[PDB]
Design a protein around this ligand. Structure first.
Ligand SMILES: CCCCCCCCCCCCCCCCCC(=O)OC[C@H](COP(=O)([O-])OCC(O)COP(=O)([O-])OC[C@@H](COC(=O)CCCCCCCCCCCCCCCCC)OC(=O)CCCCCCCCCCCCCCCCC)OC(=O)CCCCCCCCCCCCCCCCC
Ligand SMILES: CCCCCCCCCCCCCCCCCC(=O)OC[C@H](COP(=O)([O-])OCC(O)COP(=O)([O-])OC[C@@H](COC(=O)CCCCCCCCCCCCCCCCC)OC(=O)CCCCCCCCCCCCCCCCC)OC(=O)CCCCCCCCCCCCCCCCC
Ligand SMILES: CCCCCCCCCCCCCCCCCC(=O)OC[C@H](COP(=O)([O-])OCC(O)COP(=O)([O-])OC[C@@H](COC(=O)CCCCCCCCCCCCCCCCC)OC(=O)CCCCCCCCCCCCCCCCC)OC(=O)CCCCCCCCCCCCCCCCC
Ligand SMILES: CCCCCCCCCCCCCCCCCC(=O)OC[C@H](COP(=O)([O-])OCC(O)COP(=O)([O-])OC[C@@H](COC(=O)CCCCCCCCCCCCCCCCC)OC(=O)CCCCCCCCCCCCCCCCC)OC(=O)CCCCCCCCCCCCCCCCC
Ligand SMILES: CCCCCCCCCCCCCCCCCC(=O)OC[C@H](COP(=O)([O-])OCC[N+](C)(C)C)OC(=O)CCCCCCCCCCCCCCCCC
Ligand SMILES: CCCCCCCCCCCCCCCCCC(=O)OC[C@H](COP(=O)(O)OCCN)OC(=O)CCCCCCCCCCCCCCCCC
Ligand SMILES: CCCCCCCCCCCCCCCCCC(=O)OC[C@H](COP(=O)(O)OCCN)OC(=O)CCCCCCCCCCCCCCCCC
Ligand SMILES: CCCCCCCCCCCCCCCCCC(=O)OC[C@H](COP(=O)(O)OCCN)OC(=O)CCCCCCCCCCCCCCCCC
Ligand SMILES: Nc1ncnc2c1ncn2[C@@H]1O[C@H](COP(=O)(O)OP(=O)(O)OP(=O)(O)O)[C@@H](O)[C@H]1O
Lengths: 344, 51, 98, 140, 120, 320, 54, 105, 171
């Protein structure tokens, strides 16, 4: 690509969600979602291979139908009330159709079958964007209408996302799919609590971003896309094992790391409203979500694997890849539990 | 975990570039035939077209 | 008005059912998206003209704009699919599972 | 109709064995139809007849689960008169698991489903008895 | 949930109401913890780029520490203002609706009778 | 400053540097044909810089002290041992072959980095586009098994398309008895004990595979020994070439930018050589690999980045 | 008990259950047709749930 | 919204054509302007849960001005009864309903 | 001339149905053109001229490119029109039958509120301003240049960036 094209496309990606936030009109929110859709595709398809073409096609076709369903909901609301804002006393069918379309946009189960494929079929960057910057505005729509939502199917979609993300990421050798299933489970955790104190949704979102972005950078630093490729890290970049370990053990919520904070306070604010046993199920399947992280950091850190003879050139040569924000994002994660009242 | 269905799943490449069965360049074959006025009455002129 | 709005809603539902239920081809799916766009346009415009809300009349034009942009990029990806596989069919996009 | 499945609780266990029975059987058949839809859409068969056979197998299986569950529950409430006792639901869940192991020829699945369904059904009765609310409304 | 609070100015970091709150000490334990976070961040950035630790980037480490503390001070001032707003609204609400929070007074252990459960 | 999009916009483009002899040129042939003598004189006459052939010790010479390292750091292979024992169970053969492929890859990368940055043309010999010759020689004999050839061809499939071919190749041929005579007159006991079948397989692989498929993209200049001598004739033939029929015609400033950024990072270059295809002849095991890594980081000049080493003499390390 | 049955009941039953559900769950074929059919099933079930609950 | 930038800057990019009773191009009232105005002025200062029960009369009036169901049902009942009478031989319409009147102006 | 709008709506429904059955993009785009013409006609029936004419123009311009592409990419040796499949023909006929039957049903389950066949043509226009000027559509759409100058900016940027997006996808 050329600089003017990159400026245009990245500015459009920045303005998609930024339009979706600073917009009372739901039509302009839809416009922002379409901006994100339209501008992400040139970078999913920048390498021009069959995997990239398939990923971009699946993304486009899955997101356009959800956009059209959200537009159906908006048009029905305008017909009902003569207003471009979801008031109260709308129709539950409208609100549920909106919620299902947004679930298809995010990747929540049972609308999840497209995210691992697409994340596999693209570079390490544009998986980061796809999993972090594209989850925000769809979440903004829900955040703005959290009292209107059905507490039933919001939780069914959550629970299904947790179960399917854990059971998907359990058996994936490819890391681009493990991060996608992690995204699915974390979005389940968010959307479970979204009708209850929606600030915790944004908390879990920021935690998830601050974990995943360093992880995708770690995979970038040697173009790692497989367990057997991240296992050859004690020979190439052996100073990253510590942070990778602590961040994976944060993603799988464990106490002293800040990745247990979202699950903990989410279970708290659910137990305040008698969502006891659903919270128990989610907390218990988060362990199955943690199992493959444990296996992963075994494979790379604790039982260092066989290496190759050609990996010694890598030892001779030098690197410049860590961007000075890897350390910051990995250290604000894994170490910011005592600041939890300053987070909530 | 090899199921009965996933036994045939060969792993992917490393650069995310698959080796494909290269399709044939099956161009369109036209008869710029003798009846054609640009032809002088008696010219067949088979030709292959990519459009 | 209520009758034609019901019928437009059912038409959108049919186009949605279509674009969900795939066949071998893809451009048929894109055409179902175009039909959904058309039905939503008509519903919005009919509402604006019924309620005499001229301030909302800029909304269907924006719908058409962004929808034809969607069709444009879908058609670009269609070009790419053809260049790769040569046959436009959807059942060939089955190598990401591995 | 939601009233038809809420009528499971208008009279206690040990009463109206047939009503509860094919209520639960209809419920199991519904869930089996859902499972068949997901198993035919994803992972289809080599032919529509094979697909319909799959659907019937799943559906009548789940119907057998529900039938034996409801029968065993209202029986073990009729016998040993104790409707407010989740052990009846446990025994019924074990009968369900054993039927799952019959239709799917495996003793491991039989005992697995027995334990799991029994604990689940006992927890269900404890919820119905103590006032637990899955899918609660936001109150704080 | 307090975004609909009256007088809530939008996208305002520190309202003048927060200026009546006592600020941190600047010796606060979580602020020096953030300084420790910044120090460890500099050390990790050195370890990742194959540089000497505790010896290489003494301007980078100082910069990290300053950034962390200089952000944590104001973020903590904001969070204290927010918790104060919470408590203020809560006390005002119990003052407004006393009937829902009745002035309860409890009995002594002489008048009430809790059951005895022998261990044996 | 490090090069990037910012410097490109600021105006350190590539097409503003190429004039006429901004050309990659590779001199190929069999074991003893006069490629060093030819390439050095070509570089003298045209203004290019001669890159010698990329043996085992290239990553050692282009890094650090510029000295050779112990045989366990810059590989674990030996060419002498390959000659005096080629069918060893210890897979010295393919270890050597893959190490030399990687070294030729890094050679080509540094060559392009000099070309695309300075515009100066670059001379080479026996590049990555002709390193399979010795592999097919090994495989026609029993020196390696087929799985190693699959590994080699996979890594070539991953690495080769990302780089541009040479504008021209200069293949000088000698009959097999003549190269064997020049070897026996060269004075090396390890090269003397080589079969004529190895050299004939080399010649056949060259003339059958390397010449045509590179003639589809380059200007072949097949010469013989008595034309390998008199190198001024080769230079005079080079100067009056019409450098057509290549992918270099469809390269603008931004193709050059992304290639030059791919080449700026040597780990981005060598990533597809470190792949986890677990061959017994390439694997090293955790204990040996850790021992080697610690001994390597326990060397002078190593253990940290280049400028950050007070054990050498670097200074201002506490303000970098 | 120790080596076979307490291993069969508590840990290995869990392992078999979760890996079996993993297999029958994630063994998909990357076809948009099947995924979108499933999405249709989900839409249908949710509008049915709404129609019943109300 | 989520990021109330427009209030932070005072601008109104899109929050001046949210509802019907908002500044049509030439001052032509959208129908139910009065009802929507009344509902919006009753539901101000209040937020949501309380306006959903303290301004329900006005919302009902607006919902009946816009979707206009009770008038449909009323005229349907009238026409049904009229058809019944005319089929029973009881009712005949007057001159100014079969198309024979003295037009007013 | 009161069932005009119900006729047009039902024809739009049938067009979108035959569209959803997904024959070749030729006949599919023909259905699109028919349905867009019908949509233009009903929008006119509700008092809207410019919006309908623009629907027809834009969809014609799109379906032209769709023909061009489907002759290049989405073509078979046997394009499989509607009648080629007894199954698709049966689904089409069943859809029309279910249209008729469901409309007859909704004409019974409720007196009025969903579908009103006895009262039809009485509820189309809803408080016209019998004296008026500068009242048509076109004024509202021209408010994109005044009182709605955000829609114009955002759509213009959409198209501008779409150009670059298309160039890069096709590159
Ligand atoms: C805990 C998770 C550990 C996961 C296991 C990782 C592992 O397998 O060890 C690598 C092991 C390989 O050993 P190795 O190849 O010799 O290590 C290469 C070094 O990078 C060779 O590095 P070097 O010899 O060139 O330089 C030495 C380097 C050595 O520094 C290191 O590389 C490791 C330092 C980690 C300290 C962790 C302390 C834990 C504190 C808990 C409270 O720097 C130091 O001198 C240490 C300075 C003080 C510690 C700095 C750490 C700052 C980050 C703090 C994060 C705290 C999180 C807790 O395998
Ligand atoms: C000691 C150190 C403590 C810890 C240090 C950092 C720890 C690192 C880990 C943090 C991860 C979790 C962070 C999650 C979080 O920030 O809280 C969620 C937090 C909850 O928001 P909320 O209270 O539910 O509603 C916000 C209102 O809608 C929006 O209205 P508002 O009235 O709440 O005002 C928003 C406020 C937001 O500004 C902030 O202070 C948030 C900055 C948080 C960034 C993370 C540090 O003001 C601004 O927008 C700043 C603009 C300044 C303009 C110039 C005057 O999310 C945000 O507010 C993000 C705002 C994004 C602004 C762009
Ligand atoms: C060192 C050189 C730096 C300069 C030192 C400055 C010297 C000075 O005069 O000021 C010291 C400064 C103020 O002195 P002060 O006002 O006279 O005394 C204040 C009291 O200490 C009052 O202190 P406090 O007890 O009220 O602490 C305030 C704050 C606590 O704020 C904090 O400072 C955090 C302390 C860390 C715990 O919140 C708490 O009340 C305690 C919460 C503790 C939560 C810990 C939960 C997580 C468990 C540990 C997880 C493991 C770490 C993460 C994983 C690591 C592996 C990757 O206090 C300190 O910073 C000492 C820290 C005490 C450590 C407590 C550990 C328990
Ligand atoms: C609640 C409301 C708020 C939302 C919540 C907040 C959420 C946080 C935001 C979302 C976080 C995700 C965003 C990810 C950003 C994109 C990441 C990415 O693709 O870069 C990966 C990037 C990889 O770095 P690299 O591989 O060394 O690339 C070096 C280039 O090759 C260097 O060479 P080059 O040729 O590629 O040049 C690069 C060029 C690029 O300049 C441009 O930006 C393109 C525009 C050109 C204008 C002409 O820059 C320049 O050279 C100078 C400008 C010209 O790593 C990161 O960006 C990590 C930081 C990500 C930010 C996370 C912060 C979370 C807090
Ligand atoms: C039309 C708008 C969309 C509405 C839905 C379609 C409803 C009509 C479907 C009729 C079935 C047509 C068909 O199957 O293909 C047969 C034909 C193809 O014919 P053919 O290529 O098989 O040749 C037939 C040869 N003979 C005559 C000897 C049998 O294609 C069509 O009819 C589709 C064209 C549109 C039909 C509209 C007819 C309306 C009257 C206009 C005059
Ligand atoms: C919902 C449950 C679907 C159950 C499958 C029934 C089979 C079927 O007729 O629809 C499948 C069809 C998919 O198309 P295809 O894969 O090509 O099927 C072979 C046709 N030659 O589907 C389609 O092609 C699109 C069908 C859309 C139907 C719209 C009309 C609905 C009213 C009837
Ligand atoms: C309203 C009333 C609600 C009733 C709820 C009933 C619960 C249904 C249980 C979930 C259905 C799971 C069906 C299933 O077994 O998955 C099979 C399918 C692959 O099929 P296959 O491998 O051939 O079958 C193996 C036999 N187990 O595996 C898959 O393809 C995964 C499909 C999982 C999707 C489940 C989502 C259902 C919940 C929706 C929440 C809203
Ligand atoms: C309160 C008490 C609770 C205690 C729970 C603690 C449980 C610990 C679980 C650890 C289980 C590890 C067992 C591995 C032993 C090694 C066995 C082996 O040799 O590997 C082969 C094994 C396949 O064996 P097999 O089941 O016979 O299948 C093949 C036949 N076709 O291949 C394998 O199966 C490898 C092992 C895969 C593990 C699958 C995922 C395990 C998930 C653990 C549960 C997580 C908690 C979730 C909570 C909900
Ligand atoms: N890829 C390779 N595989 C196996 N052996 C190689 C490879 N590359 C070089 N060698 C060995 O290294 C030696 C290189 O000799 P080379 O052909 O470079 O001679 P030269 O330096 O060009 O001078 P002259 O051609 O005059 O001998 C040969 O003996 C050859 O066997």
């Amino acid at each position: 690509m050329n600089p003017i094209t990159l400026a245009i496309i990245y500015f459009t990606i920045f303005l998609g969600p930024v339009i979706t936030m600073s917009s009372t009109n739901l039509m302009l929110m839809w416009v922002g979602l379409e901006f994100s859709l339209l501008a992400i595709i040139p970078m999913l398809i920048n390498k021009k291979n069959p995997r990239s073409t398939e990923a971009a096609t699946k993304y486009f076709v899955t997101q356009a139908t959800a956009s059209m369903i959200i537009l159906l909901a908006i048009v029905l609301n305008y017909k009902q009330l003569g207003t471009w804002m979801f008031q109260q006393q709308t129709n539950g069918l409208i609100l549920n159709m909106t919620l299902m379309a947004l679930s298809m946009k995010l990747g929540l189960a049972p609308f999840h079958f497209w995210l691992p494929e697409v994340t596999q079929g693209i570079p390490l960057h544009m998986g980061l964007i796809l999993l972090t910057w594209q989850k925000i505005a769809p979440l903004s729509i829900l955040i703005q209408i959290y009292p209107l939502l059905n507490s039933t199917i919001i939780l069914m979609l959550a629970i299904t996302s947790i179960f399917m993300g854990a059971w998907g990421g359990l058996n994936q050798t490819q890391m681009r799919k493990i991060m996608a299933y992690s995204s699915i489970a974390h979005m389940g955790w968010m959307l479970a609590i979204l009708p209850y104190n929606p600030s915790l949704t944004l908390l879990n979102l920021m935690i998830y971003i601050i974990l995943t972005a360093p992880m995708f950078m770690a995979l970038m630093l040697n173009n790692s896309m497989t367990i057997n490729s991240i296992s050859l890290l004690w020979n190439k970049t052996p100073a990253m094992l510590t942070m990778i370990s602590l961040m994976l053990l944060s993603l799988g919520g464990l106490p002293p790391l800040t990745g247990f904070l979202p699950k903990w306070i989410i279970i708290t604010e659910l137990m305040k409203n008698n969502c006891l046993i659903m919270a128990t199920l989610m907390a218990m399947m988060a362990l199955l979500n943690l199992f493959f992280y444990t296996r992963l950091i075994y494979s790379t850190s604790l039982t260092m694997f066989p290496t190759n003879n050609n990996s010694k050139m890598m030892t001779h040569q030098t690197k410049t890849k860590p961007n000075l924000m890897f350390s910051t994002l990995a250290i604000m994660s894994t170490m910011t539990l005592p600041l939890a009242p300053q987070l909530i | 975990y090899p199921s009965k269905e996933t036994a045939h799943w060969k792993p992917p490449p490393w650069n995310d570039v698959d080796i494909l069965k290269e399709k044939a360049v099956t161009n369109m074959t036209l008869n710029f035939g003798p009846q054609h006025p640009a032809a002088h009455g008696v010219l067949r002129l088979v030709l292959e077209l990519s459009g | 008005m209520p009758s034609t709005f019901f019928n437009l809603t059912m038409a959108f539902s049919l186009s949605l059912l279509g674009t969900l239920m795939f066949r071998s081809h893809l451009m048929s799916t894109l055409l179902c998206l175009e039909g959904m766009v058309l039905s939503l346009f008509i519903m919005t415009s009919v509402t604006s003209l019924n309620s005499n809300s001229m301030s909302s009349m800029p909304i269907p034009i924006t719908i058409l704009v962004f929808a034809a942009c969607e069709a444009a990029v879908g058609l670009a990806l269609l070009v790419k699919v053809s260049n790769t596989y040569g046959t436009d069919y959807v059942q060939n996009l089955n190598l990401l599972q591995c | 109709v939601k009233r038809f499945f809420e009528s499971y609780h208008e009279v206690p266990d040990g009463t109206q064995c047939h009503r509860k029975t094919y209520i639960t059987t209809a419920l199991g058949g519904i869930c089996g139809i859902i499972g068949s839809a997901y198993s035919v859409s994803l992972n289809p068969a080599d032919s529509t007849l094979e697909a319909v056979a799959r659907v019937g197998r799943y559906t009548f299986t789940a119907a057998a689960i529900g039938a034996m569950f409801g029968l065993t529950t209202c029986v073990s409430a009729q016998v040993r008169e104790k409707p407010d006792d989740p052990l009846n639901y446990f025994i019924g869940g074990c009968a369900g698991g054993l039927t799952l192991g019959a239709r799917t020829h495996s003793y491991g699945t039989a005992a697995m489903g027995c334990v799991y369904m029994g604990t689940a059904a006992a927890l269900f009765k404890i919820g119905k008895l103590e006032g637990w609310e899955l899918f609660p409304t936001p109150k704080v | 949930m307090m975004n609909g609070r009256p007088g809530h100015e939008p996208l305002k970091f520190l309202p003048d109401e927060a200026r009546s709150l006592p600020p941190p000490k600047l010796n606060d334990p979580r602020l020096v913890y953030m300084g420790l976070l910044g120090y460890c961040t500099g050390l990790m950035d050195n370890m990742l780029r194959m540089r000497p630790v505790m010896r290489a980037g003494l301007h980078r480490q100082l910069l990290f520490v300053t950034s962390f503390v200089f952000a944590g001070y104001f973020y903590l001032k904001r969070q204290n203002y927010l918790y104060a707003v919470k408590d203020h609204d809560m006390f005002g609400y119990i003052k407004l609706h006393p009937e829902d929070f009745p002035e309860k007074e409890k009995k002594t252990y002489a008048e009430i009778l809790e059951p005895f459960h022998p261990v044996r | 400053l490090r090069y990037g999009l910012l410097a490109a916009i600021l105006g350190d483009k590539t097409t503003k540097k190429l004039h006429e002899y901004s050309r990659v040129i590779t001199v190929d042939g069999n074991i003893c044909s006069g490629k060093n003598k030819l390439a050095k004189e070509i570089a003298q006459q045209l203004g290019m810089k001669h890159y010698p052939e990329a043996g085992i010790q290239y990553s050692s010479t282009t890094t650090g002290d510029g000295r050779p390292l112990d045989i366990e750091f810059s590989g674990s292979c030996s060419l002498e041992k390959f000659y005096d024992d080629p069918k060893s169970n210890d897979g010295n053969s393919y270890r050597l072959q893959s190490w030399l492929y990687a070294s030729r890859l890094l050679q080509y990368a540094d060559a392009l980095e000099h070309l695309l940055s300075t515009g100066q043309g670059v001379v080479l010999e026996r590049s990555i586009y002709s390193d399979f010759v010795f592999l097919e020689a090994m495989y026609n004999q029993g020196y390696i098994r087929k799985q190693c050839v699959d590994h080699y061809n996979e890594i070539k499939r991953l690495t080769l398309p990302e780089y541009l071919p040479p504008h021209a190749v200069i293949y000088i041929d000698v009959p097999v008895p003549e190269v064997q005579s020049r070897i026996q007159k060269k004075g090396d006991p390890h090269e003397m004990k080589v079969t004529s079948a190895y050299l004939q397989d080399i010649e056949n692989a060259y003339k059958k595979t390397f010449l045509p498929k590179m003639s589809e993209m380059c200007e072949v200049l097949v010469y013989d020994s008595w034309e390998a001598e008199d190198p001024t004739k080769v230079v005079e033939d080079i100067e009056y070439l019409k450098y057509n029929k290549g992918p270099w015609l469809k390269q603008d400033d931004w193709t050059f930018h992304y290639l030059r950024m791919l080449v700026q990072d040597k780990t981005e270059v060598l990533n597809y050589t470190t792949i986890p295809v677990y061959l017994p002849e390439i694997t090293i095991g955790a204990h040996q690999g850790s021992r080697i890594y610690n001994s390597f980081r326990e060397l002078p000049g190593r253990k940290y980045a280049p400028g950050y080493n007070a054990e050498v003499g670097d200074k201002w390390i506490w303000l970098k | 008990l120790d080596l076979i049955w307490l291993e069969k009941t508590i840990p290995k039953s869990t392992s078999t259950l979760h890996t079996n559900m993993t297999t029958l769950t994630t063994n998909q074929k990357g076809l948009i047709k099947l995924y979108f059919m499933s999405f249709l099933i989900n839409i249908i079930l949710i509008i049915i749930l709404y129609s019943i609950n109300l | 919204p989520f990021l109330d930038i427009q209030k932070k800057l005072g601008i109104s990019l899109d929050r001046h054509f949210m509802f019907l009773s908002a500044e049509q191009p030439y001052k032509n009232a959208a129908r139910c302007h009065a009802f929507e105005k009344e509902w919006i002025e009753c539901a101000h200062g209040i937020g949501g849960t309380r306006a959903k029960k303290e301004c329900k009369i006005e919302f009902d009036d607006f919902e009946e001005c816009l979707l206009r169901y009770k008038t449909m049902r009323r005229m349907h009942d009238i026409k049904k009864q009229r058809e019944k009478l005319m089929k029973e031989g009881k009712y005949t319409p007057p001159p100014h309903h079969s198309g024979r009147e003295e037009p007013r102006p | 001339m009161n069932n005009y709008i119900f006729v047009l709506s039902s024809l739009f429904l049938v067009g979108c149905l035959g569209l959803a059955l997904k024959p070749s993009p030729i006949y599919g785009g023909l259905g699109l053109i028919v349905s867009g013409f019908v949509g233009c006609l009903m929008v006119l029936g509700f008092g809207g001229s410019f919006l309908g004419l623009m629907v027809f123009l834009i969809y014609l311009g799109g379906m032209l490119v769709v023909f061009g592409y489907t002759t290049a990419m989405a073509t078979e040796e046997y394009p499989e029109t509607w009648g080629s499949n007894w199954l698709i023909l049966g689904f089409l006929v069943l859809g029309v039958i279910m249209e008729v039957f469901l409309i007859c049903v909704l004409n019974y389950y409720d007196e009025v509120g969903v579908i009103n066949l006895d009262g039809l043509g009485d509820w189309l226009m809803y408080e016209v301003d019998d004296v008026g000027v500068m009242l048509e559509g076109g004024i509202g759409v021209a408010a994109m240049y005044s009182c709605a100058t955000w829609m114009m900016v955002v759509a213009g940027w959409s198209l501008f960036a779409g150009i670059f997006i298309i160039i890069e996808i096709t590159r």
